[PDB]
Amino acid sequence: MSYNYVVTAQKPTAVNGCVTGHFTSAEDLNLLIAKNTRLEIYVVTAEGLRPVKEVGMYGKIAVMELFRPKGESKDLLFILTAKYNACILEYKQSGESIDIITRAHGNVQDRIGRPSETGIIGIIDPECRMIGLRLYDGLFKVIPLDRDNKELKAFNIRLEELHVIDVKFLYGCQAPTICFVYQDPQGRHVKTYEVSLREKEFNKGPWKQENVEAEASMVIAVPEPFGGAIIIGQESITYHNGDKYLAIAPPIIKQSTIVCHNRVDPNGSRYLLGDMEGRLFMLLLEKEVTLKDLRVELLGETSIAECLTYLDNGVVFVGSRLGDSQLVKLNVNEQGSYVVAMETFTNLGPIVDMCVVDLERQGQGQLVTCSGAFKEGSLRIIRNGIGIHEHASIDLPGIKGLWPLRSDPNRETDDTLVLSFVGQTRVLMLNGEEVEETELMGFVDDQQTFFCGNVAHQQLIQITSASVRLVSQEPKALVSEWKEPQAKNISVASCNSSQVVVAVGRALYYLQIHPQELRQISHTEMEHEVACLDITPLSNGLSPLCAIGLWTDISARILKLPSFELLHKEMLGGEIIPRSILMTTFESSHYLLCALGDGALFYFGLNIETGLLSDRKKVTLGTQPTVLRTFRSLSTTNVFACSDRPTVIYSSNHKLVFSNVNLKEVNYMCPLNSDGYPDSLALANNSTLTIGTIDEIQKLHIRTVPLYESPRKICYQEVSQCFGVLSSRIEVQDTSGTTALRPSASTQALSSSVSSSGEEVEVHNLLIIDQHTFEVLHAHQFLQNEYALSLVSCKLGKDPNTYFIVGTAMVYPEEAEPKQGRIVVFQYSDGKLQTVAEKEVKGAVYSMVEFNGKLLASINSTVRLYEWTTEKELRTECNHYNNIMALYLKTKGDFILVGDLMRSVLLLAYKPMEGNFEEIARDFNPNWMSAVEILDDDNFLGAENAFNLFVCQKDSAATTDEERQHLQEVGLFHLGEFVNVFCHGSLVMPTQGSVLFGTVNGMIGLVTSLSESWYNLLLDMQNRLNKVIKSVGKIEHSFWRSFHTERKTEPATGFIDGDLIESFLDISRPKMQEVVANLQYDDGSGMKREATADDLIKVVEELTRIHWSHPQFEK
Amino acid sequence: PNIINFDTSLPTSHTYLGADMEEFHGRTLHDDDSCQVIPVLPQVMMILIPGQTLPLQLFHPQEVSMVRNLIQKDRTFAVLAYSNVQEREAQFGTTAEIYAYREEQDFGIEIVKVKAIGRQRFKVLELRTQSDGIQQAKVQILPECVLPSTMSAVQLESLNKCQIFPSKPSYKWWQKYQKRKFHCANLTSWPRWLYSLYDAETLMDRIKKQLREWDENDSLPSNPIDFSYRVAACLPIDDVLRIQLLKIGSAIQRLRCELDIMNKCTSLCCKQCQETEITTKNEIFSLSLCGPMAAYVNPHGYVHETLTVYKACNLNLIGRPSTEHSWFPGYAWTVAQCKICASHIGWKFTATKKDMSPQKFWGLTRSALLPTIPDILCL
Ligand SMILES: Nc1cccc2c1C(=O)N([C@H]1CCC(=O)NC1=O)C2=O
């Protein structure tokens, strides 16, 4: 609506910068990584990297450089943000307390200035006299590094050369000297200048070189003793100094564009170079002291590197924007100099498209992204839950139950897993990680076990259909056996350390565990068949209550012991009988859970002495019946719920919560505290027994499905249990006439189809990827020069089939505007993709949306609506000619939101009685727009330049027809990220609505709506938090969030920053009361009483529950 | 045909106006989105585009004294793009800043001749008439929307050093320009070819090919803003399309709109007749340095946006050729009327000397033509 809450669900993963130095101490070697708005600080260790501190800034890090001014014990850090906020930071640590303090700060933006084409360049001279900033054409800003320059005051030196490509400060010079590559009418050249510190002007530099390579783009300052500079172009690498000139152009770099570099050693005898394709090179300066020649060696392949940094021990950090980041080892006499991958780091960006699987389910929905580009392209399956580290797998099918057990009374650790099967029981012994099937004396393999385990007096119990068997630990024999008076088989079995409550049809029986004897104490008949029983002591191993579920009554009731007196009777409702029942305590407060035959779970409070339901609550846990099992996590007790959707039930603020398990269908479970598997669990499905350890806490589980090509669009087709993915791959023209660069998803599919029988070419495909295995089941190749643009998965008209529909465009280098394209309707039946129908359009099909059982498509500047007929053809119903290109298309009801690349918003309405569209409203505001979404019938969200969000609303006032057709700008916010996709979807099961967004940096965020009362409270809260929260670099949050373009800056409105709001939980108790001091809390009556810290702790806590939680950085 | 014995710089000088005029070089610009109150000239009916020159001849004492007091101030007046000429209704307009001025008081007849240039677009808040008869408009300055590159936001920092390309000498050059400038399109939802449709440089080059057909004998501006306004003042479009063009705030949308008009509107018809064809776009040529169409004032202070074409059809010629007040020195004019409806379409221009080229041409007034697409704006 008009009031929105925007919060981060996954911080940016893409790496834009990486530096090494000595930040945390003079003795430590650090690795500083910039991930947009975040700075991660690691300590390089012989084994690997150790995370020490991660900070967020109210800015997009544009420059990050470590430096050591004279008199300083360890390095300082210079950061410059995209909004020209400059700062010098220092790492301060007192024991286990870490702060990043601002030594100096200030905004270095100029009132006038044309921002340079090769962007912001920030360089520091070797002597640390100054910071040199190339922000605008014709100017070189200089910030002296004097101790007293705490406001980073600077001066500009006019540069005659207007088009500078790259600049660096040289080494071994008599005064701060810059070296740069520039272009002018006579070509590309290299020039140097001295910075006169007294004059604050440029002086004639030591050397220059006119007419360098047309493509030279990188300046490398070589340190002493040689000094000078290295220039890297497209086909050549050259060295320059006052007198010397070296030039190489080796074939090894002929087909590479080098875009990054790093100095390996302090003498600068070796450099690492990375091209746009993942090749890693080593540039060596060969001495004879003097510098004699240059040599390039191809080391191997890494991820496409944005930045490289040599660490130590031949370990290189590869910072990537298009694929996962890495730690590679350079190995690098016998072999050539080569590289081996050591560690990989998840990078979800760029997220070019995404979709939600299980959106309808309350929570438990996975997000699938089209991530990366080129050889780094992949799908990323993102789900939140508790993971299980599997340690062992046993192929043993048909398991109907698992029980932990201790065959040795002198040991406290379990050493036996007993499993039941239909009409059978097997015993497995554990000797460390060695599982070996054995026989247990006194236990029968003849019958199916309903319960078994350790009981009182150093004994074991085994409850089968035939009988109840007491077994001695030392002698391993059946000391006592209880059987039904008429030999009738048991139907339900419950037991604890000293009590056994067996159910024989409708009649319950209460046996008591005694030394070498099972004493039958009580025998009663219930008014319905017994479906589930429980006697968990909540006591000295004795529970005076018994939970029992019934068939005819369909109720879960709590009875007294040993009197069988009904203390309460609660009717569950419906026609399915219960499956499991459990009495358990969460955070000293008792409960009574009840699982139904249709995966429905009921949870009520249970009075230990009274025996009655406190609150009738229900939570659907799946389709399959649920089996509840108690287990201990730490001091407290948790319950594992086995079904098609396994769940862990726990307490939080004395209230039940339901974290889902990052696992598939689990039928049975039991805790296992073996010597080889301590504090572990056993899980059983239809065919396997798994022994694993459940993770500490809920985190994101990301499955990477590499495609080795670029995924462009994704749709989910539930009926087919698969994904439709538009993808492209680059091929190079071959002599024997085009060919692939490497195998990828579209060339490695199980089955494939085609649309017809040295420069690059894009081959477009439709992949059908299985949703469980992720194998490429099929690949369809589009026509030569045909660009696949849009994709939907839907049912049309009266047709029951679900189709994959693709909108294409014919792309010819000679034609600027697309004049040809088509809509192809595909069906994935059995194992193949069939083309059902095709529709030629006279333009590009930029977008497609299923619209009320019809296909709404935007072709060029028009919006067309198609009907799917019984002859299985798309027949044109109506058209809407827009004065804009219909790039974006979103619909809600009969409304259509149409948008172009320049932020032109058009609102249309399908008139069913007229058979055409009517323009409702519009808004022209030229700015680059990257995505749009409909929030509700009246409000529209969009992402516009530069990294902003905006909300426009159709007018409430309705004064006149002109006011009715004009959209009002009600929200603006500088997000700091570039949104590629918006989609409605549930993350976790006040606020209304959920809109997720995917970005270029791999960040995933959420936009939800607020009431005016909530927005006004949180807006006040932000202004009070902005006075409490310390900002790295002393940047005002309001300046950071202000809507921004190079030309304009307006304050944010209509948006609440959830990342700032949630930081309230991390501030001190006294500071919390300063924040909430004059806040007006509204409980739901208008009576705005004063807000307390506890009111806002509960308010901000439920806000954290609407999105995925962020992981702690440091160990 | 070629231009011979005719100085193409002569028409932009407006020598028919008279002797040398005092020139003013100071420049007044009002803040973006600011509210200014600027005087409107009463009988001016033209729709002015920024950068476009407007010659005027004022004879009424209230107009003469209004410009006299305008010279002593910011030299700016408001030119309204009338939505209703009869109802005197206007929603938009352009300021015109006087750059040249001359007074004539020969025979006791005061005449003020001015040359003004369009500066800034605005939105009309209100129109109030003054005691002197001069309307005064309260206007809100519309800002020129300047956008960076489409890629400036999603651009990888490592490929920043590749954003300067070697000098343009070629279809192969444009293929390489697109592939390198829009390489980071791979991080977004759209292809490089889409980003080309919104690239000022590519759009100006597309226009430049068709503008070269009109003026076969590279003086156009480099700034997309200046180029789009220079092209806007040359398109012979009807008043309804010209007001839509003026309403555009971005040079990208303006260049895109101009390319659509140039690719669709290829036949010029009589506005009164509507379906009667006067000339085709193939006949349009630039006799003036400013292009194929410029504003010129007649002896009675009436402004005509005259378009020069090689041949015009379906016109009848009335009167005898006259060189009086001729906007093309060396040519005589003859009134041309539509043969069907007799509406004044423009004039036939005949050369007075046999050594001139072209020996004949047509000057068609913009207000008389209707551009048809032989079988609304588009940005
Ligand atoms: N002498 C008169 C008298 C009435 C109308 C006009 C002229 C006249 O000269 N022009 C045009 C004709 C065409 C031209 O070259 N210059 C003009 O001022 C008129 O519209």
Ligand SMILES: [Zn+2]
């Ligand atoms: Zn006519």
